[PDB]
């Protein structure tokens, strides 16, 4: 088990980073902090403390756990938290993501 950011290990620590999170963003800090994410200070850019995965451009209805599974399926935190079945389900829902983001 190897973490990327030991300082952002706890929920309380990640919550602290959302102090200056833009009020206009339609995703709530607690939902993002719970999915292992913390605010990186630029735009609406969040990173996972474990896999170092970065996400941005948060739209309304976006589920942080689904997005975590969608883009960073091998994250060991996402797996002990949500399980292989969930990760495999989301992966099945979006089976050509590389070719989705590659134009
Ligand atoms: C997260 C929710 C958002 N919207 C669902 C989304 O999926 N957003 C996506 C997203 O973020 N990412 C994926 C694809 C981009 C889209 C944005 C387009 N949404 C339009 C849309 C409209 C309608 C339907 C679907 C989608 C790739 C991984 C991540 C990302 O770009 N990370 C960057 C980053 C780095 C550092 C820190 C933070 C973030 C980064 C960028 C380039 C290289 C490396 C890392
Ligand atoms: Zn992760």
| Per-domain residue ranges of the chain | 1-103
Point out residues after which the chain has a gap (C–N over 2.5 Å). none
How far apart are the C-alpha atoms of 16 and 31, rounded to whole Å?
A: 14
CATH number for the domain formed by residue range(s) 1-103? 1.10.1170.10
Report CA dihedral (88, 93, 99, 102) to the nearest 10 degrees.
-100
Angle, vertex CA 78, rays to CA 77 and CA 79, nearest 5: 90
DSSP label of 81:
H
- Going from the Cα of 17 to the center of ligand 2, the distance in angstroms, rounded, reads 17
User: Is the separation of the CB atoms in 65 and 35 below 8 Å?
Assistant: yes
Does ligand 1 lie within 6 Å of residue 54's CB atom?
A: yes
Which approach determined this entry? X-ray
80 CB within 6 A, ligand 1: no
């Amino acid at each position: 088990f190897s973490i990327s950011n030991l300082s952002m290990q706890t929920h309380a620590a990640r919550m602290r980073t959302f102090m200056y999170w833009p009020s206009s963003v339609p995703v709530q800090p607690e939902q993002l902090a719970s999915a292992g994410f913390y605010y990186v200070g630029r735009n609406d850019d969040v990173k996972c403390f474990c896999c170092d995965g970065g996400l941005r451009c948060w739209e309304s209805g976006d589920d942080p756990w689904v997005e975590h599974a969608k883009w960073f399926p091998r994250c060991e935190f996402l797996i002990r938290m949500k399980g292989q079945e969930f990760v495999d389900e989301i992966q099945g829902r979006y089976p050509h993501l590389l070719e989705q983001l590659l134009s």
